Design an enzyme around this catalytic site. Structure first.
Site, PDB file in Angstrom:
ATOM      1  N   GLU A 142       0.745  -1.254   0.000  1.00 18.42           N
ATOM      2  CA  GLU A 142       0.000   0.000   0.000  1.00 18.42           C
ATOM      3  C   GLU A 142       0.780   1.313   0.000  1.00 18.42           C
ATOM      4  O   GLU A 142       0.373   2.280  -0.641  1.00 18.42           O
ATOM      5  CB  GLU A 142      -0.936   0.010   1.213  1.00 18.42           C
ATOM      6  N   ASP A 144       3.852   4.195  -0.490  1.00 23.51           N
ATOM      7  CA  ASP A 144       4.917   4.671  -1.370  1.00 23.51           C
ATOM      8  C   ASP A 144       5.932   5.504  -0.586  1.00 23.51           C
ATOM      9  O   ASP A 144       5.820   5.657   0.633  1.00 23.51           O
ATOM     10  CB  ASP A 144       4.350   5.500  -2.544  1.00 23.51           C
ATOM     11  N   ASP A 184       5.429  -0.757  -2.648  1.00 23.63           N
ATOM     12  CA  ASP A 184       4.396  -0.223  -3.525  1.00 23.63           C
ATOM     13  C   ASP A 184       5.101   0.651  -4.567  1.00 23.63           C
ATOM     14  O   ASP A 184       6.120   0.258  -5.141  1.00 23.63           O
ATOM     15  CB  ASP A 184       3.405   0.597  -2.687  1.00 23.63           C
ATOM     16  N   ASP A 188       4.265   8.852  -6.373  1.00 18.32           N
ATOM     17  CA  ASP A 188       2.958   8.901  -7.013  1.00 18.32           C
ATOM     18  C   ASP A 188       2.491  10.338  -7.131  1.00 18.32           C
ATOM     19  O   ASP A 188       2.657  11.127  -6.205  1.00 18.32           O
ATOM     20  CB  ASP A 188       1.920   8.119  -6.203  1.00 18.32           C
ATOM     21  N   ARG A 241       7.793   2.188 -15.206  1.00 20.83           N
ATOM     22  CA  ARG A 241       7.181   3.448 -14.834  1.00 20.83           C
ATOM     23  C   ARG A 241       8.212   4.463 -14.370  1.00 20.83           C
ATOM     24  O   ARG A 241       8.132   4.949 -13.243  1.00 20.83           O
ATOM     25  CB  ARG A 241       6.161   3.228 -13.710  1.00 20.83           C
TER      26      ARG A 241
END
Length: 361
Positions: A142, A144, A184, A188, A241
């Site tokens: 979950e 970051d 995670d 983000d 990513r």
């Protein structure tokens, strides 16, 4: 307290989205009483309680977000490890060892948070003590290292290092016959956030790295937002990513990407992920990917549901690369700020590598 860093008062450069439609000055206007030197999580939270008042928080050494107390379960980790950074804040690391462990730095715009500078600090990605299972996807983590969400805007990330550090993915255990994923994302940027500049930073050793725009069905909030500029950064040993984007408009230039398609832990998949309504303008980037031949150059950019991607002057393993035949439509939006894309040479790549990340400011 006294200002130790002679660069602490600097605002974001003229280059980058963090300097458009307003400037990102962080807490440069802080009064002396709002200039702190923190050495632990208690002092950090205390400094942050200044809220939207201009503040400069100088980080000395390692800040253990857990406070030396391991998280017992998901609820505990959720309640103690997510540190919110309020508006008009400059978090700047002192020396070469300013570091955060066991937690996440959250730039949440719900309370109007904006104008934040995170600089010269190392953030070791947190370990989820209680991954959740999703039938058909396995275990999922979950937390970051850093999250920019709920409309947060005008954020400058400079000379920051994000890495799995002392706990790399090859150290994952197995539970119920499936890899117990405890990491995670790294960074983000989502839910309507905007005007961000990421410069001179380093993301080293990590899988699911930078996701900009978390959902295909969240366009109502992300459309026309998520403008992010990335320059002079290094993405080393990152699986995917470097920038996977949905709805956002990414300007990535003079960045160094180093990986290996056969890396035993962080196998290179791709760098740029072109998602739903996302756009990427790649310029003068350096891709040095072991076990990736020139004939497979298009592997650096992967199409998902998006179609906008243009590259100008990037190189793959030392030679100019043409990605115009990889199947994307040109990036036509104008870049509002003046910028200078330096010709990418091995000399420039080395310079960028030598100056990227925390402790190099």
């Amino acid at each position: 307290a006294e200002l130790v860093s002679d660069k602490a008062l600097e605002s974001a450069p003229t280059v980058g989205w963090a300097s458009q439609n307003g400037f990102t000055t962080g807490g440069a206007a802080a009064t002396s009483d709002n200039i702190y030197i923190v050495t632990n999580i208690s002092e950090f939270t205390s400094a942050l309680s200044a809220g939207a008042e201009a503040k400069i928080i100088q980080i000395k050494g390692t800040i253990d977000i857990s406070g030396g107390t391991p998280y017992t379960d998901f609820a505990d980790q959720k309640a103690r490890s997510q540190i919110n950074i309020p508006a008009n804040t400059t978090v700047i690391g002192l020396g070469t060892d300013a570091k955060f462990i066991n937690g996440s730095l959250i730039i949440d715009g719900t309370d109007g948070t904006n104008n934040v500078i995170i600089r010269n600090v190392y953030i070791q990605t947190p370990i989820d003590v209680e991954p959740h299972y999703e039938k058909g996807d396995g275990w999922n983590a979950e937390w970051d290292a850093m999250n920019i969400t709920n409309g947060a805007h005008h954020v400058w990330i400079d000379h920051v290092t994000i890495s799995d550090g002392n706990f790399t993915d090859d150290m994952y255990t197995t539970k119920d016959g499936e890899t117990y994923v405890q990491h995670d994302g790294a960074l983000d940027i989502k839910r309507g956030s905007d005007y961000v500049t990421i410069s001179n930073s380093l993301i080293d050793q990590h899988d699911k790295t930078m996701l900009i725009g978390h959902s295909d069905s969240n366009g109502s909030q992300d459309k026309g937002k998520l403008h992010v500029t990335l320059f002079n950064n290094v993405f080393n040993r990152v699986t995917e990513r470097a920038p996977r984007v949905r709805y956002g408009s990414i300007h990535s230039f003079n960045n160094v990407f180093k990986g290996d398609a056969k890396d035993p832990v962080y196998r290179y998949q791709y760098s740029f992920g072109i998602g739903t309504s996302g756009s990427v303008l790649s310029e003068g980037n350096s891709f040095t990917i072991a076990n990736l031949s020139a004939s497979k150059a298009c592997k650096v950019v992967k199409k998902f549901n998006g179609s906008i991607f243009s590259d100008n002057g990037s190189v793959l393993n030392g030679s100019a690369v043409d990605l115009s035949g990889c199947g994307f439509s040109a990036y036509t939006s104008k870049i509002p700020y003046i910028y200078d894309v330096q010709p990418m040479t091995t000399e420039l790549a080395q310079s960028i590598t030598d100056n990227a990340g925390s402790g190099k400011l």
